Amino acid sequence: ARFSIEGKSLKLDAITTEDEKSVFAVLLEDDSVKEIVLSGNTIGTEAARWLSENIASKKDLEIAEFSDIFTGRVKDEIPEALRLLLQALLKCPKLHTVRLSDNAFGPTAQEPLIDFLSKHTPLEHLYLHNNGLGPQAGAKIARALQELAVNKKAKNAPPLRSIICGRNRLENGSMKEWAKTFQSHRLLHTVKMVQNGIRPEGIEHLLLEGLAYCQELKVLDLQDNTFTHLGSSALAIALKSWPNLRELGLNDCLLSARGAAAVVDAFSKLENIGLQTLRLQYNEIELDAVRTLKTVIDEKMPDLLFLELNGNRFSEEDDVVDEIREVFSTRGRGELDELDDME
Numbered sequence: 001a002r003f004s005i006e007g008k009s010l011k012l013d014a015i016t017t018e019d020e021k022s023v024f025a026v027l028l029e030d031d032s033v034k035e036i037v038l039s040g041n042t043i044g045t046e047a048a049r050w051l052s053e054n055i056a057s058k059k060d061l062e063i064a065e066f067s068d069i070f071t072g073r074v075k076d077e078i079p080e081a082l083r084l085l086l087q088a089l090l091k092c093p094k095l096h097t098v099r100l101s102d103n104a105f106g107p108t109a110q111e112p113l114i115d116f117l118s119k120h121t122p123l124e125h126l127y128l129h130n131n132g133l134g135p136q137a138g139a140k141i142a143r144a145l146q147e148l149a150v151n152k153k154a155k156n157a158p159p160l161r162s163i164i165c166g167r168n169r170l171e172n173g174s175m176k177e178w179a180k181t182f183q184s185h186r187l188l189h190t191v192k193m194v195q196n197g198i199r200p201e202g203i204e205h206l207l208l209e210g211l212a213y214c215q216e217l218k219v220l221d222l223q224d225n226t227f228t229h230l231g232s233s234a235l236a237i238a239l240k241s242w243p244n245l246r247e248l249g250l251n252d253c254l255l256s257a258r259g260a261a262a263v264v265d266a267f268s269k270l271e272n273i274g275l276q277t278l279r280l281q282y283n284e285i286e287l288d289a290v291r292t293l294k295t296v297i298d299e300k301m302p303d304l305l306f307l308e309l310n311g312n313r314f315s316e317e318d319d320v321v322d323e324i325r326e327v328f329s330t331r332g333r334g335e336l337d338e339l340d341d342m343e
Contacts, residue, residue: 001034001035002034003027004065005023005037005040007041008129009040010169011307012041012044013044015051016059021133024051027051028198031057031060036065037097038069040068041065042071042072042275044073044081045081045084047127048081048082048085049252050085052085052088052307061095062094063097063098065128066085066098066099068103071265075106075109077138078103078114079109082109082112086113087116090116092122096122097126098125098127100127100131101131104129117141117145119151119152124158124159124204125161125162126162126165126239127164129236130166132169133169133170135174137171139178140175142178145184146184148160160187164191166195166223170196170336174330175206182194182213182214183213189217189219190219191217191247192219192221194221199225200297203231204230208237208238211236211238213244217249218244219245219247220245227254228249229256231264232259235266239267240270243270246275247278250263251283252283252284255284257285260286261286261288261292264293264301265292265295271297271300273302273303275301275304276305280309281311282310283311284343287318294327297327300328307324308336309336309337309339316334
């Protein structure tokens with residue numbers, strides 16, 4: 001029920017009659033296959049075409065791990081294989097998770113991608129990390145996902161719950177579009193838009209016009225995007241929208257001292273905070289916010305397991321540090337990160 005050729009570094013311009021009888025033997029004599037991992041290889045057109053037919057018959061397929069399967073191929077030649085693969089996946093009624101990370105999808109590769117994403121209603125978890133999409137394409141993806149929501153509503157399919165789309169230069173450009181996307185999938189659980197060069201205005205809009213609508217949100221990671229006070233203020237207002245929030249990842253987001261103080265203050269006003277992990281590395285956070293944050297944790301975050309504050313504007317030797325450590329010790333649960341690189 002699980003076929004994989006992970007990291008074998010197989011250059012497959014086409015599936016030879018040889019390996020067809022060995023390497024992919026399983027894909028042939030077994031249709032129960034629930035999972036398929038192809039990552040770590042280079043799939044040429046013909047190979048894809050062969051896989052395309054043997055993937056379309058795996059009606060019990062649930063997971064399609066196709067990340068990193070084009071390394072070494074000319075950007076503008078990847079489309080044909082991508083279309084053949086995605087079209088095969090489209091015929092699998094239980095395929096709920098699909099990863100296509102680490103694949104250079106240029107303007108031409110988009111079409112197949114957009115077509116797929118906008119029609120595959122059983123899709124629940126999407127992983128599209130590091131594809132050099134850029135804002136132009138960034139928005140095209142967001143647009144297609146909005147179409148997916150319409151088709152899901154029509155066909156009564158399960159809701160989309162995970163969207164991992166980082167390191168794709170989404171920037172401020174595609175932000176108005178993505179906000180609409182989140183308005184379309186209010187039952188999401190995990191959203192990770194890391195390292196997308198989004199700036200303050202974009203972060204603000206994303207938060208208030210998008211994520212703030214997802215009241216089921218459990219995990220949110222916006223690591224390495226510029227917030228400043230602006231975005232921080234936005235995040236402050238939004239926090240109250242995520243009562244089920246468990247993980248907030250704000251590492252390297254330049255929240256700023258005042259921004260971070262806003263965020264800590266917003267948290268102090270929330271009841272029943274079931275927050276478990278809070279990442280705030282390199283945010284120019286200063287002592288006073290950390291002092292406030294500490295009582296807030298001690299009095300309003302009974303389930304906190306991890307707190308990351310390294311890289312900020314305060315010393316590891318300041319009395320709050322040992323106070324936070326005391327809250328965790330007394331509780332028998334709770335952990336603070338190694339503060340070995342304060343500013």
